[PDB]
């Protein structure tokens, strides 16, 4: 098929050529001799044309291309925004789970391009390409869902899932043999930090400093609140507040943007910008496992 | 709006084909009848080029039929799916 | 505020059960559960490492190892 | 559409051509030509009619399946 061929070509173009070999070592769809027939020192057009030749010599399909896309996503895992779904209310099996999920998504409207790829730490990665009742599913607007066996949490990349969100949720909860499924308001791009947060897996004596008690108290409070461990890499926060003025409630809306949050916030108190004890709205981001807030009077 | 250029070229092709066919079975009086038919064709071309139509989209004459078939199949498939959905 | 126990071990229900009241039974129960999980995992990976000689296929194991499915040939 | 306007013009042109011509064999050939082209033109007009009908039906079943 030409569609799968151009899909694989686009995925390869997305892959940096410096690691394409690793991709093959992770893809393993093509024989190692075919890999040896291609040198990676030559031009990008030449290498992609040779890869097209290699995949056309074999039988190119959708499952192998989807697996390649999944493994590319694994190696990057930095280009999408992730949200977290919680299931609530004990026997598991991979095969029957896959069968049930596939059956539900086929029953969704008529068809959908679904691909599975088991990963270490029970990380089943699922690539889903949506399609309507009268069109083949589109491979240009995919979505990714990460499931952990026998766990109350799942991860989803929401690029176009706002079209049909309840469908994916109900399919996931029926496949997970769980009744209640909810979406907590927690959204971020560093997927590994989300993993850590959801599971809680994280001299010149002539100078006479004055107010040194204030400095030692503020540094101690900051250390006790944050800790010596490297804080999870979180990148976006937003609070929606509506509280009485006390100085008709004022409605406030703040967004914190930072390439490395929880560290500038860690340095605010030592820099003297904020008080020694920070407000609970900022000291419970890893504690409450909450990223978006709403405050009323 | 004047006639769409694709429609003009299509119509001109059909007039050429029909004039060739009507010249095929004509043995005598070839030159005068072919000149008269050429004048007829050119006057018809001028009339159709000058003709005015409201701005309504009208797709290529040859392909539309095929589209219908596909469209019909689409509906059938849709209906089938609809039935399945209702069945569920 | 911090823990190292893997998440697939159920404790939050046990937390609502006996974390607030009768903490000793809470700790004893979680100790039993972790011991059972560790024993199951030790049996599983011991089988995978040692007795793979007569096994004809990979074993499907859950993180909690409540369900085990495998195939074996004996001569 | 465009055809809905060009067919009456074609009919009037065929009428004037038939009136001006005098040869009986040429008259019969022109009549057969007119019959063939009129049949094809009305056929494609009908095809466009069920084209727009099928488009409306497709939209209706799209809403229904949604």
Curated annotation (Swiss-Prot), chain A:
One cellular component term from this protein's GO annotations in UniProt: nucleoplasm
Alphabetized Pfam families for the sequence: CENP-N (PF05238)
Localization: Nucleus; Chromosome, Centromere, Kinetochore
Keywords: Centromere, Chromosome, Kinetochore, Nucleus, Phosphoprotein
Modified residues (Phosphoserine): 205
GO biological process: CENP-A containing chromatin assembly; chromosome segregation
Predominant subcellular localization, coarse grouping: nucleus
Superkingdom per UniProt: Eukaryota
Family as reported in the entry's similarity comment: Belongs to the CENP-N/CHL4 family.
Function of the molecule: Component of the CENPA-NAC (nucleosome-associated) complex, a complex that plays a central role in assembly of kinetochore proteins, mitotic progression and chromosome segregation. The CENPA-NAC complex recruits the CENPA-CAD (nucleosome distal) complex and may be involved in incorporation of newly synthesized CENPA into centromeres. CENPN is the first protein to bind specifically to CENPA nucleosomes and the direct binding of CENPA nucleosomes by CENPN is required for centromere assembly. Required for chromosome congression and efficiently align the chromosomes on a metaphase plate.
Protein name in UniProt: Centromere protein N
Lineage: Eukaryota, Metazoa, Chordata, Craniata, Vertebrata
UniProtKB/Swiss-Prot annotation, chain B:
Gene behind this protein: CENPQ
Places the protein is found: Nucleus; Chromosome, Centromere
Recorded family membership: Belongs to the CENP-Q/OKP1 family.
Portion held of the full protein: 74 to 161 of 268
Organism: Homo sapiens
Cited function: Component of the CENPA-CAD (nucleosome distal) complex, a complex recruited to centromeres which is involved in assembly of kinetochore proteins, mitotic progression and chromosome segregation. May be involved in incorporation of newly synthesized CENPA into centromeres via its interaction with the CENPA-NAC complex. Plays an important role in chromosome congression and in the recruitment of CENP-O complex (which comprises CENPO, CENPP, CENPQ and CENPU), CENPE and PLK1 to the kinetochores.
Name of the molecule in the record: Centromere protein Q
Assembly with partners or alone: Component of the CENPA-CAD complex, composed of CENPI, CENPK, CENPL, CENPO, CENPP, CENPQ, CENPR and CENPS. The CENPA-CAD complex interacts with the CENPA-NAC complex, at least composed of CENPA, CENPC, CENPH, CENPM, CENPN, CENPT and CENPU.
UniProtKB/Swiss-Prot annotation, chain C:
UniProt-annotated location(s): Nucleus; Chromosome, Centromere; Chromosome, Centromere, Kinetochore
Domain of life: Eukaryota
UniProt function note: Component of the CENPA-CAD (nucleosome distal) complex, a complex recruited to centromeres which is involved in assembly of kinetochore proteins, mitotic progression and chromosome segregation. May be involved in incorporation of newly synthesized CENPA into centromeres via its interaction with the CENPA-NAC complex. Modulates the kinetochore-bound levels of NDC80 complex.
Family: Belongs to the CENP-O/MCM21 family.
Assembly with partners or alone: Component of the CENPA-CAD complex, composed of CENPI, CENPK, CENPL, CENPO, CENPP, CENPQ, CENPR and CENPS. The CENPA-CAD complex interacts with the CENPA-NAC complex, at least composed of CENPA, CENPC, CENPH, CENPM, CENPN, CENPT and CENPU.
Protein name: Centromere protein O
Curated annotation (Swiss-Prot), chain D:
Domain of life: Eukaryota
Tissue: Expressed at high levels in the testis, fetal liver, thymus, bone marrow and at lower levels in the lymph nodes, placenta, colon and spleen. Present in all cell lines examined, including B-cells, T-cells, epithelial cells and fibroblast cells. Expressed at high levels in glioblastoma cell lines.
Motif (Nuclear localization signal): 55-66
Family in the record: Belongs to the CENP-U/AME1 family.
Subunit structure: Component of the CENPA-NAC complex, at least composed of CENPA, CENPC, CENPH, CENPM, CENPN, CENPT and CENPU. The CENPA-NAC complex interacts with the CENPA-CAD complex, composed of CENPI, CENPK, CENPL, CENPO, CENPP, CENPQ, CENPR and CENPS. Interacts with MLF1. Interacts with PLK1.
Function: Component of the CENPA-NAC (nucleosome-associated) complex, a complex that plays a central role in assembly of kinetochore proteins, mitotic progression and chromosome segregation. The CENPA-NAC complex recruits the CENPA-CAD (nucleosome distal) complex and may be involved in incorporation of newly synthesized CENPA into centromeres. Plays an important role in the correct PLK1 localization to the mitotic kinetochores. A scaffold protein responsible for the initial recruitment and maintenance of the kinetochore PLK1 population until its degradation. Involved in transcriptional repression.
Protein name from the UniProt record: Centromere protein U
Annotated gene: CENPU
């Amino acid at each position: 098929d030409e569609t799968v061929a151009e899909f694989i070509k686009r995925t390869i173009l997305k892959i940096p050529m410096n690691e394409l070999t690793t991709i093959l070592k992770a893809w393993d769809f093509l024989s190692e001799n075919q890999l040896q027939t291609v040198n990676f020192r030559q031009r990008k057009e030449s290498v992609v044309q040779h890869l097209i030749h290699l995949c056309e010599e074999k039988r190119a399909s959708i499952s192998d291309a989807a697996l390649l896309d999944i493994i590319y996503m694994q190696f990057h895992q930095h280009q999408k925004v992730w949200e977290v779904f919680q299931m609530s209310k004990d026997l598991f099996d991979m095969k029957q789970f896959k069968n049930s999920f596939k059956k539900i998504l086929q029953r969704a409207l008529k068809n959908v391009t679904v691909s599975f790829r088991e990963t270490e730490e029970n990380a089943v990665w699922i690539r889903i390409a949506w399609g309507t009742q009268y069109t083949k599913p589109n491979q240009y607007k995919p979505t990714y869902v990460v499931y952990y066996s026998q766990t109350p949490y799942a991860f989803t990349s929401s690029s176009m899932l706002r079209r049909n969100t309840p469908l994916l949720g109900q399919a996931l909860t029926i496949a997970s043999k769980h009744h209640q499924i909810v979406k907590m308001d927690l959204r971020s791009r560093y997927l590994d930090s989300l993993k850590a947060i959801v599971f809680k897996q994280y001299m010149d004596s002539r100078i006479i400093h004055e107010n040194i008690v204030e400095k030692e108290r503020v540094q101690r409070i900051t250390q006790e609140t944050f800790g010596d461990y490297p804080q999870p890499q979180l990148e976006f926060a937003q609070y929606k507040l509506e509280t009485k003025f006390k100085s008709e409630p004022l409605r406030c809306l703040i967004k914190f943007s930072s390439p490395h949050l929880l560290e500038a916030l860690k340095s605010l108190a030592p820099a003297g910008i904020a008080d020694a004890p920070l407000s609970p709205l900022l000291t419970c981001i890893p504690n409450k496992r909450m990223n978006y807030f709403k405050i009323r009077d | 709006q004047p006639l769409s250029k694709s429609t003009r070229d299509h119509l001109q092709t059909m007039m050429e084909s029909v004039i060739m066919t009507i010249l095929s079975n004509s043995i005598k009086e070839k030159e005068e009848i072919q000149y008269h038919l050429n004048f007829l064709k050119k006057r018809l071309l001028q009339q159709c080029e000058t003709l005015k139509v409201p701005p309504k989209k009208m797709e290529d004459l040859t392909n539309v039929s095929s589209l219908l078939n596909m469209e019909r199949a689409r509906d059938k498939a849709n209906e089938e799916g609809l039935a399945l959905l209702q069945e569920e | 505020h911090h823990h190292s126990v893997p998440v697939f071990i159920p404790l939050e229900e046990i937390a609502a059960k006996y974390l607030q009241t009768n903490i000793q039974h809470f700790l004893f129960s979680l100790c039993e559960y972790l011991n059972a999980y560790s024993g199951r995992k030790y049996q599983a990976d011991r089988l995978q490492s040692d007795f793979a000689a007569l096994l004809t296929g990979p074993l499907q194991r859950n993180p909690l190892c409540n369900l085990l499915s495998f195939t074996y040939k004996l001569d | 559409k465009e055809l809905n306007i060009v067919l009456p013009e074609f009919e009037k042109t065929h009428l004037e051509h038939q009136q001006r011509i005098e040869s009986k064999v040429c008259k019969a050939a022109i009549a057969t030509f007119y019959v063939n082209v009129k049949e094809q033109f009305i056929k494609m007009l009908k095809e466009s009619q069920m084209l727009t009908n099928l488009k409306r039906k497709n939209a209706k079943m799209i809403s229904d399946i949604e």
